[PDB]
Design a protein around this ligand. Sequence first.
Ligand code: OTS
Length: 424
Amino acid sequence: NPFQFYLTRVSGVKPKYNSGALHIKDILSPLFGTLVSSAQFNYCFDVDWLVKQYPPEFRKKPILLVHGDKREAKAHLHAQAKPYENISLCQAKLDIAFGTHHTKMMLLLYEEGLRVVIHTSNLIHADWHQKTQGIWLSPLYPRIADGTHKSGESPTHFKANLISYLTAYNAPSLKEWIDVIHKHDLSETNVYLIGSTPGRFQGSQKDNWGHFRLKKLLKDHASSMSWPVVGQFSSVGSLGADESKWLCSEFKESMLTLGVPLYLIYPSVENVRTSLEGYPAGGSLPYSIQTAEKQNWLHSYFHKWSAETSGRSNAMPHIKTYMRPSPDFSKIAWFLVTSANLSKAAWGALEKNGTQLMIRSYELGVLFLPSALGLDSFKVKQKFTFPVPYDLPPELYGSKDRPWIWNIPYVKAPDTHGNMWVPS
Ligand SMILES: NC[C@@H](O)c1ccc(O)cc1
């Protein structure tokens, strides 16, 4: 299995739909390695829940929580962590307004080597219960023979790129993790890292992050052969007064690069209303009416969440994926799973007449390119060749459909659990 791409377990579907799926308890189990230390990068944390996901034998090993919380929220997290002597925190600097530390990553240092997990789930129970979420699992990276001279680098430059990503935090506690990574052999890695980090980037530095990083990799490591672009996500930023301001101009321009129909997949109200969670699934789909009302034009690109292929049409998506399928959707030129939602905050926007890329947040994903496996393209696995986790082709919103908008009421029809939704 060359991809090592997994979905999280969903409670309450037929067990057949959880056969190749992973819960965090599985990821942290002793079968995966004898744990010594770990770092947990994320956005939201429930510390009591998190510690419980570790096997009892490992619960006292050091854990570093990497977060972006400030003021009172930061206070709250420290309070959550206080009781656990083995837990340290690293506040990632967020010097730009409206940025978040949104990266979901685990660094797992074992007696036997090192593992990197890049995923989409917050570290709270509900994100691992009945949502569609995605995971990439690195191989077990061995320590470099303490007596030999090797880079430990892969053809995709994953090791150097991961170090550069951690270096951007400028954080004492991560330097230690950087040193650990230095000591291991990551040469078997066959994916490319795509990161976002907060800043304003000029010239050559523009290629390092966000959608320009993606553009760069697609220019260099894909070849060009009407192949649509698909974007799928759970949060929607303010994209501008029309499609030409950002979405179709710089964003789509990066996505269609190689060596055009745009499908966007975002749950409708109906998708949410009849999900396994009902309306409260919408708590993790924070599209606000203030944003939506500025950009009604966007919604003509929206397609319903549908995942009969994975038994997950009723498990609302918190995964974010981007991809480039062929005209008949039977193959893809590339696939990306990442933390990055559909916002300029996450992906970058051009400033100062296009000489500067502004990114607000930390984001992280892995790009699957056929060239890294010695191929031109991947055939799509039609029944969860690349395991695309939702149905193709994507289905357009019907005429009575609306995008899920979190902060308005839904009181005309009850959800799965016989409840209404009145946010306030
Ligand atoms: N702000 C916390 C809550 O609204 C939330 C947190 C994480 C998400 O991915 C979506 C929503």
